[PDB]
Amino acid sequence: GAHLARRYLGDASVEPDPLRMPTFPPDYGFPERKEREMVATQQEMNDAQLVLQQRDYCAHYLIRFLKCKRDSFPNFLACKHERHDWDYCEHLDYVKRMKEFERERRLLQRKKRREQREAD
Amino acid sequence: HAFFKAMLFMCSGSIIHSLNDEQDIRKMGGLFKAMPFTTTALIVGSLALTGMPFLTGFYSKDLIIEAANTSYTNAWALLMTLIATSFTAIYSTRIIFFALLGQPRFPTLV
Amino acid sequence: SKMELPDYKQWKIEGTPLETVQEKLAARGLRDPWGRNEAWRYMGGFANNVSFVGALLKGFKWGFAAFVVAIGAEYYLESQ
Amino acid sequence: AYLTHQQKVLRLYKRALRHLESWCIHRDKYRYFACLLRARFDEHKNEKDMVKATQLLREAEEEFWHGQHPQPYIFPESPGGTSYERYECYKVPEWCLDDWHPSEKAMYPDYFAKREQWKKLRRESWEREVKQLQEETPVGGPRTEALPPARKQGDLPPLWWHIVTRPRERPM
Amino acid sequence: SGYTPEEKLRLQQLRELRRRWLKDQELSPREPVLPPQYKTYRHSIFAFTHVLIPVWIIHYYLKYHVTTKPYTIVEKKPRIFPGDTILETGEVIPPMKEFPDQHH
Amino acid sequence: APPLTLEGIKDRVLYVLKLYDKIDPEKLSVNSHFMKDLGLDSLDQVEIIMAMEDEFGFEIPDIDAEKLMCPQEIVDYIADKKDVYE
Amino acid sequence: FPKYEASRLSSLPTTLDPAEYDISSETRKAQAERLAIRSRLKREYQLQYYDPSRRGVIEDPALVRWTYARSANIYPNFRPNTKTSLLGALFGIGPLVFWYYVFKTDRDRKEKLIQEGKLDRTFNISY
Amino acid sequence: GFILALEISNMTKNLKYHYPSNAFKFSTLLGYFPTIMHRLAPYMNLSMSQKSASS
Amino acid sequence: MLKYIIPTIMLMPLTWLSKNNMIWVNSTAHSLLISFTSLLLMNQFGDNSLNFSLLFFSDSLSTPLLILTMWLLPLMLMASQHHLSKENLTRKKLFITMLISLQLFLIMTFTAMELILFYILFEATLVPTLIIITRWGNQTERLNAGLYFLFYTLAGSLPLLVALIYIQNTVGSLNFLMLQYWVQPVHNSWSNVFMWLACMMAFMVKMPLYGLHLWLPKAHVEAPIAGSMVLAAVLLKLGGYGMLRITLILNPMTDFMAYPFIMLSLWGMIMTSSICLRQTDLKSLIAYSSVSHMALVIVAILIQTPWSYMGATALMIAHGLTSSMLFCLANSNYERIHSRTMILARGLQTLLPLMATWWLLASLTNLALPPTINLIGELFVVMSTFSWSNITIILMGVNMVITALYSLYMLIMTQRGKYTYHINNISPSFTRENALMSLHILPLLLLTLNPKIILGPLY
Amino acid sequence: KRLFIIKPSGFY
Amino acid sequence: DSWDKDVYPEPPRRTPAPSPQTSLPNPITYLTKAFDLLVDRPVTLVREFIERQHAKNKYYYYHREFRRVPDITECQEKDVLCMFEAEMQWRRDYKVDQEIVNIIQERLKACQQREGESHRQNCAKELEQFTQVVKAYQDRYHDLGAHYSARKCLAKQKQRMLAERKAAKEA
Amino acid sequence: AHIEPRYRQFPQLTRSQVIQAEFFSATMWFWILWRFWHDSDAVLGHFPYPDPSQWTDEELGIPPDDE
Amino acid sequence: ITKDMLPGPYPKTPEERAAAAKKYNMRVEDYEPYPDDGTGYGDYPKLPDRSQQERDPWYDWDHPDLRLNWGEPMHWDLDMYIRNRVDTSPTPVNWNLMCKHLFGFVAFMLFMFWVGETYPAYQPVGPKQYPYNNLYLERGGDPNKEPEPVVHYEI
Ligand SMILES: CCCCCCCCCCCCO[C@@H]1O[C@H](CO)[C@@H](O[C@H]2O[C@H](CO)[C@@H](O)[C@H](O)[C@H]2O)[C@H](O)[C@H]1O
Ligand SMILES: CCCCCCCCCCCCO[C@@H]1O[C@H](CO)[C@@H](O[C@H]2O[C@H](CO)[C@@H](O)[C@H](O)[C@H]2O)[C@H](O)[C@H]1O
Ligand SMILES: CCCCCCCCCCCCO[C@@H]1O[C@H](CO)[C@@H](O[C@H]2O[C@H](CO)[C@@H](O)[C@H](O)[C@H]2O)[C@H](O)[C@H]1O
Ligand SMILES: CCCCCCCCCCCCO[C@@H]1O[C@H](CO)[C@@H](O[C@H]2O[C@H](CO)[C@@H](O)[C@H](O)[C@H]2O)[C@H](O)[C@H]1O
Ligand SMILES: CCCCCCCCCCCCO[C@@H]1O[C@H](CO)[C@@H](O[C@H]2O[C@H](CO)[C@@H](O)[C@H](O)[C@H]2O)[C@H](O)[C@H]1O
Ligand SMILES: *C(=O)CCCCCCCCCCCCC
Secondary structure (H helix, E strand, O other), rough: OOHHHHHHOHHHHHHHOOOOOOOOOOOOOOOOEEOOOOOOOHHHHHOOOHHHHHHHHOOOHHHHHHHHHHHOOOOOOHHHHHHHHHHHHHHHHHHHHHHHHHHHHHHHHHHHHOOOHOOO | OOHHHHHHHHHHHHHHHHOOOOOOOOHOOOOOOOHHHHHHHHHHHHHHHHHOOOOHHHHHHHHHHHHHOOOOOOOOHHHHHHHHHHHHHHHHHHHHHHHHHOOOOOEOOO | OOOOOOOOHHOOOOOHHHHHHHHHHHHHHHOOOOOHHHHHHHHHOOOOOOOOHHHHOOOHHHHHHHHHHHHHHHHHHOEE | OOOHHHHHHHHHHHHHHHHHHHOOOHHHHHHHHHHHHHHHHHHHHOOOOHHHHEEEEEEEHHHHHHOOOOOOOOOOOOOOOOOOOOOHOOOOOOHHHHHHHHHHHHHOOOHHHHHHEEEEEEEEEHHHHHHHHHHOOOOOOOOOOOOOOOOOOOOOOOOOOHHHOOOOOOOO | OOOHHHHHHHHHHHHHHHHHHHHOEEHHHHHHOOOOOOOOHHHHHHHHHHHHHHHHHHHHHHHHHHOOOOOOOOOOOOOOOOOEEOOOOOOOOOOOOOOOOOOO | OOOOHHHHHHHHHHHHHHOOOOOOOOOOOOOOOOOOOOOOOHHHHHHHHHHHHHHOOOOOOOOHHHOOOOHHHHHHHHHHOOOOOO | OOOOOOOOOOOOOHHHHHOOOOHHHHHHHHHHHHHHHHHHHHHHHHHHHHHOOOOHHHHHHHHHHHHHHOOOOOOHHHHOOHHHHHHHHHHHHHHHHHHHHHHHHHHHHHHHHHHHHOOOOOOOOOO | HHHHHHHHHOOOOOOOOOOHHHHHHHHOHHHHHHHHHHHHHHHHHHHHHHHHHHH | HHHHHHHHHHHHHHOOOOOOOOOOHHHHHHHHHHHHHHHHOOOOOOOOOOOOOEEEEEEHHHHHHHHHHHHHHHHHHHHHHOOOOOOOOHHHHHHHHHHHHHHHHHHHOOOOHHHHHHHHHHHHOOHHHHHHHHHHHHOOOHHHHHHHHHHHHHHHHHHHHHHHHHHHHHHHOEEEHHEEEHHHOOOOHHHHHHHHHHHHHHHHHHHOOOOOOOOOHHHHOOHHHHHHHHHHHHHHHHHHHHHHHHHHHHHOOOOHHHHHHHHHHHHHHHHHHHHOOOOOOOHHHHHHHHHHHHHHHHHHHOOOOHHHHHHHHHEEEHHHHHHHHHHHHHHHHHHHHHOOOOOOOOHHHOOOOOHHHHHHHHHHHHHHOOOOOOHHHHHHHHHHHHHOEEEEEEHHHHHHHHHHHHHHHHHHHHHOOOOOOOOOOOOOOOOHHHHHHHHHHHHHOOOOHHHHHHHOOOO | EOOOOOOOOOOO | OOOOOOOOOOOOOOOOOOOOOOOOOOHHHHHHHHHHHHHHHHHHHHHHHHHHHHOOOOOOOOOOOHHHOOOHHHHHOOOOHHHHHHHHHHHHHHHHHHHHHHHHHHHHHHHHHHHHHHHHHOHHHHHHHHHHHHHHHHHHHOOOOOOOOHHHHHHHHHHHHHHHHHHHHHH | OOOOOOOOOOOOOOHHHHHHHHHHHHHHHHHHHHHHOOOOHHHHHHOOOHHHOOOOHHHHHHHOOOO | OOOOOOOOOOOOOOOHHHHHHHHOOOOOOOOOOOOOEEEEOOOOOOOOOOOHHHOOOOOOOEEOOOOOOOOOOOOOOOOHHHOOOOOOOOOOOHHHHHHHHHHHHHHHHHHHHHHHHOOOOOOOOOOOOOHHHHHOOOOOOOOOOOOOOOOEOOO
């Protein structure tokens, strides 16, 4: 994407580093951030034998889809609505990560302005 | 891959058998109408190989490509992989153009 | 069982790309003496072959008609 | 080299036509360029100076090597072709039939009766074939691999058995 | 450039012999002289002898030999989902907690 | 493949030559010598052999090809290589 | 046209070799007597290969010479000189000394690590 | 790829002769990998086997 | 062991008192019955070896070697009786006597409980083997081959004799059970460096060790078929068996004394596998294959781990059946074309189909196709050598590549391609020849089902 | 026409 | 059943009850019924017949008990008669210890399969027990060589005990 | 047999072979058109892609440049 | 064969060069021993180093697969030059040019892969977040230690 062009062909000092992000406190600029809520208990994901990479904040929708899949067998075309619920939840999770990348970039942009203006 | 690749080889075997063990595409041609069922399978196998939407090949190859350009990955590997996908459509077109289309280039005893 | 070969007098380059070759050779003062040996490849059922676009669209006419008929059935099946 | 100047030019002609055919592919395009190539050969057909003729042949070979197809067409059963020697595993020499068990030979009584006649014909002719070769060969052995015909009635051409009885090209 | 008369004559004589040889390779009507020696039923005895008899042997072998030893057949335990009822004990697995039921 | 016959091979050998514009189809016989009777040259002979290779789908080595100077010789060479005895 | 550069594994085509052309009566004489040797050897072979009463192997002296030349005849023609001694030393002692220091060095390192407890052997109980 | 392939394929039907490019030979002869490796490696190994190890 | 020694001796009166037309039938039948009873030796215990008397014992190392030895005598008789058909009757009986006397020395050698008794029998096998090679070999070079065989062995054996007697003087006993409990460590000194060498060089020559192997291509090629069968299958294993026993009393000096000989073997196998690629003589090719395989046995014995001893034992048994089968396969060709040149007769699969199956099966076992016991042994040795030093995987891996090339090269050159036109006496395979081939391969492949009985004492 | 197939003896 | 549940433990089985949410018939349900009728039933009768024959001929075999003899620690040096018994005992215990490590390895492998994608957390006890037993086995028997014996095992133990004494001496 | 070879002529065809080929060629295009109608998302995109430059600083908690 | 027909020592004199050439069925003009460097070739003729794949396919060889004639001297390295092994036939592309293009292609691709590893492609997305202190317990973390808390917030 353009972000690579800015970091590699441009100035990487104001570009998030995907490996080390975030480099700012969570609460900087955010008076009272809500803590992310988890619906599915650890025991429930354990008993559903979800793959560890699947045990994220959307796991409660996955559990419903897998249960529907089993109960609707052999109709492998049912559970479409449950699959979408899980797919949409993962889309919202991905959007959040996109925002975290934009917040990190905008702070690194600010941190340079607040250094250039102070420098002069 | 097992499905359309085994089909493609059986289609080439059908052509090779019918032309007295001829294997060079430069000596095929004009088989689109002469071998209708082999032609259909060859086109279906070629379209599946190139990721034609909703054929068997599309359900693996397409997900692989969009999982590879959204990953944290070597940029040369990603770019080389994308060019190879383009090359896949080129040699596929070679078989259909030279084996099925145009005028027959095989010996006179049909 | 003798295989009766077709009469050789029926192979003629007229009306085939071989006739074009002869004209481009005639300009330079040459002739193609084997043109009639190639003519069978441009005649009969080997004349006129699909293009590459046409090859891909084999069966598209009936497949589309079935597709049109199918969505009509599905659509009305939901409405009623 | 044991090929005359004529045989080298004629060979170069055929070889260049085949490689030209591999580049052109389409028959009409091949016919057009085969005639231009023929015109080039006809242009020096009457060159009398052998020295100038040889130089023309040298250049033509150099040009052919530069312009040859890296992957020319080969007939499937030609050397290098995809069917070359494909059926050698099915060619069994005729002498293997002498080892067949009698119960195997009893299955083809008519075939092995004829086979005996051929073997009889081989024995009874061998001496004349050797004698004919002895009396037509100059002292110090033959100078060529050519062989003579039979010169009489009932004589068979010397050294014929393995030509006549060789395995069929498609034995099985 | 063609054949010399000697060359032609030798080829002529070999050709007669070769063609006679090839003719003699043809089989007579009686040869070979052999010594002394619907789908449903055909498909039924295949299923019987190749599917049923083997599965009989394998089931006997697994049930009374392989499964009488520890850890020979190990199954992944079934997935348990909220709301399932266990057959062994009848325990009812509690449902998951209420979602924000957001849809789009 | 459908088996060849001596008459089958001869017909196709003559068929090809009748489609060669340098041979008169009325003066042509199985015994017509390409140089002495039909008045062709050696460059022409190479093309005739090339055309019989394409016709029957197998190559004739140059050493063998240069000796085939009449249609009957081509018929005999092909029948010999394909084990055709009729 | 860049000229053909022959290699050991990519020989020169005859159609590009000058020796093929500009033939002399001396070259055509050599070819004639080469073809004579081949014709004489062919006749000797054919007289046996076509013999109806022959049953066995036509012994070939050329094959016998080849297998003998590449076995029994080597030592009689061996001479210890600068070439053979240097080659014998290089390909006979050379590799043995090389692999010795490779394995000795590797195994000395491993033993040192095991003594101190710095080599991971947590589940290593098969050897 | 299909569009570019079609143009390249259709240009084989024109009456124009073009000398092969270096890239064309590289592709046709498989990058010369079999031509080089399958002559060089067998030669070195097989010659060593006879000259040094055995003789 | 008297239940095997006495009947083995009784084979000699049986052969000499047989009718002139029944010497092969009688000896083959009764050597098979002896082979049958040898299975009673597999009464092996987890802790204790089977100790019969003050003279003889059997353990999981000697038991499989004994069973292989007694099985080979019947097979050597069938392999021999064709080319000895024209032989004088009394000379035929003497030939069989040499084979019987060789078996007698072998079964006692593998079971002698005292090392000096082992030495005398270990050496007594030279006499019948030497007579078999020089008397009944075909070529002029058999005389030279006997001399090389005799003096290569003796040059190493005579120092061993002095070392053993020295060990008895200082320890007071050479009984192997006693040596298990009275063994003391060997501390570094130039005196002990040469005790170690004298204890190991006789066995290395027999293996053979690379560098000391020149006697084997000569001897294994000049011998008659029966001589080659026993030389490859059993006599080479006297070296391996001897090393496996005597290394008990050489620790810890084996730690650094093994290095020169591990290097000779690791590099030797790659050198002798490469030689096989350019061999023109089929029997010579097979002989050089034995050197390559026995190099693994030497390395496995020297590194001295539980896995390498199991692998060494499996390799010795597997090689014995394979190498013996290959010599027999090549002999069948030689009995038809009277030449050992590999390229002489080609495309034989076209003329001898079933015998081409045996060639394939023999070749596959030679290149160690899993799960053959050839692979089991070769894999166990590679596992233990990797632990000894990881870099050895490079040399083991390369040898596995080269071994496949020459194993299939021999198969392709002789069996595939086009038959040689002028060779017209390839008669169909006899029943004797087919049975002789199947009596190697069938037991070899059956042992895969129960490999624990050929893995030795450390299983 | 059925032709004779030359094979080595299979009996043994 | 046939083996001891304590030596080869298996957690209680919890199979969920069928909860079909489809009108369609389940092919597995009818295949299971066909399997019971055409396979399990005739196989069971053939076994019940065989068990009727084994009950008419009931006979017993026993597990060999080995009385304990003195260890190599109690043997006077070069006293073969006592060394032999201690050595044979040590070899018997060596084979048994190999089988103990095999039991613990078989528990570990069964747990990994049984727990599915949750094995990394649900098999921590079996991993720990495997780690401890492998450590003990390594201390007893590792690096002894092909010519291992009770004497060599004792020397390895004494060397280990000496180092442990010295390390404590540092404390 | 059922089909005889021809010389320099287009081969003989059976009605069955031509009809079956057309049917499966047609079935290919029905499937693609049917799936494309009901599953165009799998080819064009399942979810919108947000434009990160359209997000307000208060959404992202980027504080004013003064404090 | 008899001892007079087997290979011998390096030929010292023209009379011995004529005997060797006759023994090997060669012309004395065409006969050339290997150099007398003590490597053990003796008088065995030095023949051109060419594969058997290079010989005329259409000639009637006594050994068609080998393309040898009965009685002709075999190359010292005949078994290395059979058609299954080393091929020496002319190539359409010069050997040195062939090596340059192959090596150049490989070196360039390896160089470009190193560059692509230095400048990896990735999406403008923050790290994926997992619940329960980053799945500390699930991933095998010790349950007897309280992990360094990991908190993820909304945005
Ligand atoms: C995921 C699967 C995707 C499959 C895509 C399949 C191919 C898509 C279309 C490719 C281009 C179509 O082809 C486009 O139109 C016509 C063919 O109708 C071509 O027209 C061609 O016709 C004749 C063939 O008789 C050629 O000789 C001529 O050179 C050219 O004019 C154009 O040169 C080309 O630009
Ligand atoms: C294929 C052949 C393989 C050859 C392998 C060669 C192995 C060489 C082993 C060398 C080690 C010999 O063992 C070594 O002997 C000397 C005897 O002088 C002993 O040392 C003794 O003599 C030396 C004198 O040289 C003194 O330094 C020392 O004070 C004394 O104790 C060493 O304590 C011992 O370490
Ligand atoms: C034919 C192929 C030839 C290839 C070349 C092979 C060279 C082989 C040299 C033989 C080994 C010589 O080197 C040998 O190393 C070992 C250590 O590993 C030493 O072993 C000894 O010394 C070490 C420390 O040095 C001490 O722990 C101990 O006293 C003892 O193990 C030997 O005293 C030494 O003699
Ligand atoms: C699950 C979806 C299933 C969809 C099935 C759709 C119905 C199947 C249709 C099979 C078609 C059978 O009918 C076939 O069609 C083709 C194309 O028109 C016809 O071909 C037509 O055009 C060609 C040339 O343009 C003519 O040579 C031919 O005479 C003419 O009829 C065939 O002669 C006919 O046999
Ligand atoms: C879509 C493809 C994506 C991957 C693309 C990879 C591209 C790889 C390019 C590698 C090119 C290496 O090949 C390079 O070519 C030139 C041209 O012949 C060679 O140069 C050679 O050619 C000519 C002479 O004929 C001269 O310039 C020079 O004397 C000679 O060395 C180089 O010695 C070689 O290094
Ligand atoms: C930025 O998002 C990183 C992706 C790395 C390269 C992906 C290649 C996509 C090419 C887009 C051009 C449009 C042509 C369809």
